[PDB]
């Protein structure tokens, strides 16, 4: 069976809104168009979309929705599509999804853990085992507990398959790089023929058995995604054989970050030469500036973002864990702070503390 798997479109997004707005639509529609055309070429049997097709959970553009529905329509013409909504997809999409799956057999939405059986273009029997994004909402415990039970059930249901079983998930697996439920890859039932994931923007082969893939986004959404790969994935599945796959490159506009410590006439030179004929977008992060950059950014169109290197000494305290937190605050007591003040400036006498200690032990009885 021939499959197109694509995800994390984010239709409707504009980047660097605060800073220098870039509406990504044009780029994105080019990527989508190239992926769709490729699907027609290969004449795939099945189309799997694994979530975050829209950018906004709450206020979705009418242009975005228009675009999304048009793409769904184009895709349906070539092969049945199966859609698993993500955490960022508009809340109402599921409703329309539900409505429309009871109306065509060329599109089906899955919004629970409930398996559904579908038929591909050449009549291949496909069981979809869905694992939607896990609401944030010991209690974690019971939730992971509940989530294991659901994965157990998908396994049961994978065993009853006819031709193919496919897992569709939208979540983060263990091993990358906040308040998400991270899910170990080992928990993805091996008896499935394919495990299609979404939610992560870099293409990533998660494991070979079962074959587990994030196809990644179709555009570079922000500067963390300077190096990674963007596209969809073509997958072929055959009963007897192991699965085969092939990335379909999206060829998106490049991103680039320039690093300088001092913005001098020299940095001023590189920056201009760097942005000069760049089809993409550029960020500079810096340490010391004389007000050049805000002025510069104004006049270089594809320079979309400037940013102070955040101090390490400042990075930490927000990572810093409840272990470190309690120590820190308890080191802030008026007296245990008074410790080092003494140990600094009269150093030698610490009976003074033993003096202090009973002294405070005394009053706390009054």
């Amino acid at each position: 069976m021939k499959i197109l798997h694509t995800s994390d479109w984010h239709l409707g997004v504009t980047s660097w809104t605060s800073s220098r707005p870039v509406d990504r639509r044009e780029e994105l529609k080019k990527a989508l168009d190239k992926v769709v055309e490729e699907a027609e070429k290969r004449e795939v049997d099945l189309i799997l979309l694994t979530g975050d097709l829209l950018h906004s959970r709450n206020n979705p553009s009418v242009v975005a929705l228009h675009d999304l529905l048009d793409y769904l329509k184009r895709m349906m013409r070539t092969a049945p599509v199966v859609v698993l909504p993500g955490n960022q997809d508009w809340k109402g999409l599921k409703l329309f999804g539900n409505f429309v799956t009871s109306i065509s057999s060329d599109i089906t939405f899955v919004m629970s853990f409930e398996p559904v059986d579908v038929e591909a273009k050449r009549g291949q029997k496909v069981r979809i085992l869905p694992f939607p994004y896990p609401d944030e909402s010991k209690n974690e415990g019971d939730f992971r507990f509940f989530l294991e039970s659901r994965l157990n059930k998908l396994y049961e249901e994978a065993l009853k398959k006819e031709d193919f079983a496919i897992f569709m998930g939208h979540f983060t697996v263990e091993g990358l790089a906040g308040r998400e439920i991270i899910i170990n890859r080992a928990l993805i039932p091996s008896v499935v023929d394919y495990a299609a994931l979404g939610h992560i923007h870099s293409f990533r082969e998660i494991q070979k058995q079962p074959l587990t893939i994030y196809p990644g986004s179709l555009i570079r959404i922000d500067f963390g995604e300077e190096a990674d790969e963007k596209g969809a994935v073509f997958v072929e599945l055959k009963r007897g054989e192991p699965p085969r796959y092939e990335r379909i490159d999206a060829s998106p506009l490049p991103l680039k970050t320039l690093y300088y410590k001092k913005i001098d006439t020299s940095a001023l030179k590189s920056i201009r030469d760097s942005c000069r004929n760049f089809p993409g977008y550029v960020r500079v992060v810096y340490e010391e500036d004389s007000g050049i950059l805000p002025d510069l950014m104004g006049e270089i169109d594809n320079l979309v973002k400037i940013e102070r290197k955040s101090r390490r000494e400042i990075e930490e305290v927000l990572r810093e864990s409840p272990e470190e937190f309690k120590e820190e605050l308890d080191k802030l007591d008026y007296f245990e702070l008074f410790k080092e003040y003494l140990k600094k400036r009269e150093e030698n006498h610490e009976k003074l503390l033993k003096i202090l200690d009973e002294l405070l032990d005394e009053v706390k009885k009054s």
């Binding site: 605060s18 500036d289 003040y341 002294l359 405070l360």
Partner: protein, 357 residues
């Protein structure tokens, strides 16, 4: 600590008719239409504790003029040191009587008076709480329209309430006078193998003179202390600003430069010069930071309609940052009638027409 509000009950106070609500830990957002009585709620607490609110000068102005029975009744239940306290006030418009009553709750249906009369109740409440009304509204009870009060306060007031929040100034006051008494008895005993008993009695005395010194020259350890705490606070604030503004905005404290100093891209900018949105974002980070560093001391954090001037993209950014407060079993309440800011949180107390709906 561990100051911690428990129950609030309100009848005929400002725009509130009848409300009885219990404070959970974590985040509640309080919502409803304009004039529904959201702010009235926040003021009821202020009034319960201190016998005044933000909005009127006279007690009896606070009586709900739209109730035929013109008596406001506030019942406020909090906690501090494993102990429960409850405060009861009544204001009567016709009589122009203000009644107030403070008592401890105990082993069961049990009540131990501490004050009647509103002067004594205020007195005893400050005592219990440790903090003044002024430091309360500038730190964790941020009243509508006044989000930036701390931010633009004189350095004097800034340190004067860092001390108040962090000191245990009564443990301190007993100490200072336990020392005088310890030293005087010793001096007395000196003014009267004998050199050996005298050695010890004088050895003991000169420590005490030292401990006294590094403790009540004020302009020494006290300043040192407030500086180190402000450091811990601004450390966190700078971090939040770096997230929220890509390192564009920075904040510092300098008693000689007039207090909190804000810089935009390295350049000094008076708070009055900021955009409304920027002022809010900075006040919130500062306040949020204060509340973190003050965990243990204070267990509550209220923001009264402080999100209006935020634009859509700052609203999300800021909601995201405030959830990092959910970690501290603080009772946290945000009053807002804004959809885009409230969508972010799960638990809602809705008020319309002066009641919960």
């Amino acid at each position: 600590g561990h100051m911690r509000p428990e129950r609030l009950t309100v009848r005929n106070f400002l725009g509130l008719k009848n409300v009885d609500i219990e404070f959970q830990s974590g985040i509640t957002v309080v919502e409803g239409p304009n004039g529904a009585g959201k702010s009235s709620l926040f003021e009821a607490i202020s009034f319960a504790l201190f016998g005044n609110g933000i909005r009127y000068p006279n007690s009896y102005d606070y009586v709900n003029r739209n109730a035929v029975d013109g008596t406001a009744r506030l019942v406020f239940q909090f906690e501090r040191g494993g102990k429960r306290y409850e405060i009861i006030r009544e204001i009567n418009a016709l009589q122009r009587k203000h009644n107030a009553k403070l008592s401890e709750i105990l082993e069961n249906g049990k009540k131990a008076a501490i004050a009647a009369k509103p002067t004594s109740v205020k007195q005893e409440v400050e005592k219990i709480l440790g903090i003044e009304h002024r430091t309360f509204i500038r730190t964790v009870f941020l009243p509508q329209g006044e989000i930036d009060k701390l931010l633009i306060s004189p350095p004097s007031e800034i340190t004067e309430i860092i001390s108040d929040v962090f000191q245990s100034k009564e443990t301190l006051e007993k100490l200072e006078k336990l020392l005088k008494e310890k030293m005087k008895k010793l001096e007395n005993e000196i003014s009267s193998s004998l050199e050996k008993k005298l050695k010890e009695m004088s050895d003991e005395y000169n420590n005490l003179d030292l401990l006294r010194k590094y403790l009540f020259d004020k302009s020494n350890f006290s300043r040192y202390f407030t500086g180190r705490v402000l450091e811990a606070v601004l450390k966190r604030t700078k971090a939040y600003l770096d997230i929220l503004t890509n390192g564009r905005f920075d904040i510092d404290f300098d008693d000689e430069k007039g207090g909190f100093i804000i810089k935009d891209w390295g350049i000094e900018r008076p708070a009055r010069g900021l955009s409304g949105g920027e002022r809010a974002l900075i006040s919130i980070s500062l306040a949020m930071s204060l509340a973190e560093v003050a965990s243990g001391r204070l267990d509550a954090f209220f923001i009264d309609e402080g999100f209006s001037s935020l634009c859509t993209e700052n609203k999300e950014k800021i909601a995201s940052v405030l959830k990092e407060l959910e970690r501290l079993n603080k009772v946290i309440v945000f009053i807002t009638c804004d959809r885009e800011f409230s969508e972010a949180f799960d638990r809602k107390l809705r008020i319309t027409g002066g009641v919960v709906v």
